[PDB]
Design a binder for this molecule. Structure first.
Ligand SMILES: CC[C@H](N)C(=O)N[C@@H]1C(=O)N2[C@@H](CC[C@@H]1CCN)CC[C@H]2C(=O)NC(c1ccccc1)c1ccccc1
Ligand SMILES: CC[C@H](N)C(=O)N[C@@H]1C(=O)N2[C@@H](CC[C@@H]1CCN)CC[C@H]2C(=O)NC(c1ccccc1)c1ccccc1
Ligand SMILES: [Zn+2]
Ligand SMILES: [Zn+2]
Lengths: 101, 101
């Protein structure tokens, strides 16, 4: 019942093709696999399914982790990585905040 | 490397038979799927691969959760349930403890 917000980008290849001019350290193959396609604008990327937008990618950041961190509600993410993966990213954040602050 | 501790109980078939005569509040189907077999001695069970023993099963405890809770380093558990599930169980524990006073 949760239709993708961008059906034309539902294909992996459809997404990698948006990374023609891709000059950034974060891997194009990983970004597409994680559901993201580039917007031809900064390093801005969007998830074809949930429509989540991400920018300012740091050297060693995982597209999957960042997808779950910011947009845990994504159906595509859930089907690819499962509940555990998602809940883990969020359990970690809470534990860490709880241990420090 | 990590050779199974009781090689004879590797087959699901071998484990289920160990129950049959089973009078306890925990589902024997799941225990066997989780890698456990009964000892015909209380409600004591043991995992075929890691040798981890469990006892005193409450009404609604999950064989897999309990396995991960007490014996996180079991190879069979890792191959069956994966990294995320295991860490998941332990993160929750950490987060809980760390949250309660
Ligand atoms: C992806 C890893 C990166 N280091 C990061 O965490 N980026 C965050 C981010 O992309 N967003 C969060 C803000 C904190 C970060 C940005 C500041 N370094 C909130 C959602 C996202 C974001 O800023 N998205 C953009 C956007 C819009 C459209 C397409 C792609 C990205 C945004 C801009 C303006 C308003 C709302 C969202
Ligand atoms: C499995 C769920 C249950 N509620 C539970 O948590 N049981 C624990 C348990 O089985 N073990 C932990 C102790 C707390 C529990 C027991 C009393 N609530 C530690 C390991 C295990 C346990 O008691 N194992 C037994 C044992 C021995 C041989 C076969 C099976 C179980 C044990 C008894 C005495 C010494 C060492 C281990
Ligand atoms: Zn998404
Ligand atoms: Zn085990």
């Amino acid at each position: 019942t949760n239709l993708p917000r961008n059906p034309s980008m539902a294909d992996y290849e459809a997404r990698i093709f948006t990374f023609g001019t891709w000059i950034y350290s974060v891997n194009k193959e990983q970004l597409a696999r994680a559901g993201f396609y580039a917007l031809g604008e900064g390093d801005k990327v969007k998830c074809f399914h949930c429509g989540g937008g991400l920018t300012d990618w740091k050297p060693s950041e995982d597209p999957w982790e960042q997808h779950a961190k910011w947009y845990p509600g994504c159906k595509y993410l859930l089907e690819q990585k499962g509940q555990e993966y998602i809940n883990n990213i969020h359990l970690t954040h809470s534990l860490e905040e709880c241990l420090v602050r």
